[PDB]
């Protein structure tokens, strides 16, 4: 029993973290087979950042412009290329700790584990969701760029995020492992602001199922709702509209608990309109939106506490 924000074991990713230095900038990179991946702004200086031209800044670098350090060992760079907002540095050595892996572009509302790293050395692991506004609420200090996000299924690591920067509201922005930003952000020091965010409705519902599976029914009611009527309530409380595809996704959790999705939606609508106040769900005072339906099935018993 119990329910915790839970990260994936991090060892397969730890074995891939290196340090990349260009001039006076040092940050982390990811070493798979014979390539190291890192944020391209490693080639910039501070005044370069206001209005960088990477194609122009990069043509000015050689292979020996980049120092790659794996633990105590220096990796010699033997080629480099830009891919969108990352560099791919070819090194003379294949990482013998390369796990089975894929590069995935994660969708908003999905979760992943972040291994926060400094100077190529892992410092901690936590879980976070891709917000609908394409930011994450991470924990990052200077030198964390190049830290990665990932999910694991079986013994395959799906890398989905590489860290680049922090926005004025204290939230974080970065790219997939093809160097493409999540959201409308660019890698330069210019005014950029996270768009307005919303609550991930699908996740809130999944976590209410979590609560029922773990044995709590207090917030249920005898009502049902149409999808459309729920959505008028959703819009007023700044929740993402619920779709039939989201309803479908909740099928297996619905079946495990015998509670119809639209019945749980009515329950949610009641919680938004009347509050919880005083009461907790899974130890929480508020409605939680950072667990996916998949995160619930992963962690909960496949047997309901009836």
């Amino acid at each position: 029993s119990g329910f915790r924000k839970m990260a994936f074991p991090s060892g397969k990713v730890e074995g891939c973290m290196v340090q990349v230095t260009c001039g006076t900038t040092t940050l982390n990179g990811l070493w798979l087979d014979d390539t190291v991946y890192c944020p391209r702004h490693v080639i910039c200086t501070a005044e370069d950042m206001l209005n960088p031209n990477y194609e122009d800044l990069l043509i000015r670098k050689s292979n020996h412009s980049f120092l790659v350090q794996a633990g105590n060992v220096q990796l010699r760079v033997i080629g480099h290329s830009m891919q969108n907002c990352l560099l791919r540095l070819k090194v003379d050595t294949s990482n013998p700790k390369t796990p089975k892996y894929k590069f995935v572009r994660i969708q908003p509302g999905q979760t992943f584990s972040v291994l926060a790293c400094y100077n190529g050395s892992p410092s901690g692991v936590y879980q976070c969701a891709m917000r609908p506004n394409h930011t994450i609420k991470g924990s990052f200090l200077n030198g964390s760029c190049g830290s990665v996000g990932f999910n694991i299924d079986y013994d395959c690591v799906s890398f989905c995020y590489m860290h680049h920067m922090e926005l004025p509201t204290g939230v974080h922005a970065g790219t997939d492992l093809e160097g493409k930003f999540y959201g409308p952000f660019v890698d330069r020091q210019t005014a950029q602001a996270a768009g307005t965010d919303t609550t991930i409705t699908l996740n809130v519902l999944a976590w209410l199922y979590a609560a029922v599976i773990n044995g709590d029914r207090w917030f249920l009611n005898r009502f049902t709702t149409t999808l459309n009527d729920f959505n008028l309530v959703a819009m007023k409380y700044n929740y993402e509209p619920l779709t039939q595809d989201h309803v479908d996704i909740l099928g297996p959790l619905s079946a495990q608990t015998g509670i119809a999705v639209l019945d749980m939606c009515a329950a949610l609508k009641e919680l938004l309109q009347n509050g919880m106040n005083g009461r907790t769900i899974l130890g929480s005072t508020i409605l939680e939106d950072e667990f996916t339906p998949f995160d619930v099935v992963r962690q909960c018993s496949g047997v309901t506490f009836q």
Partner: peptide, 4 residues
């Protein structure tokens, strides 16, 4: 923005 803050690059990290």
């Amino acid at each position: 923005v803050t690059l990290x």
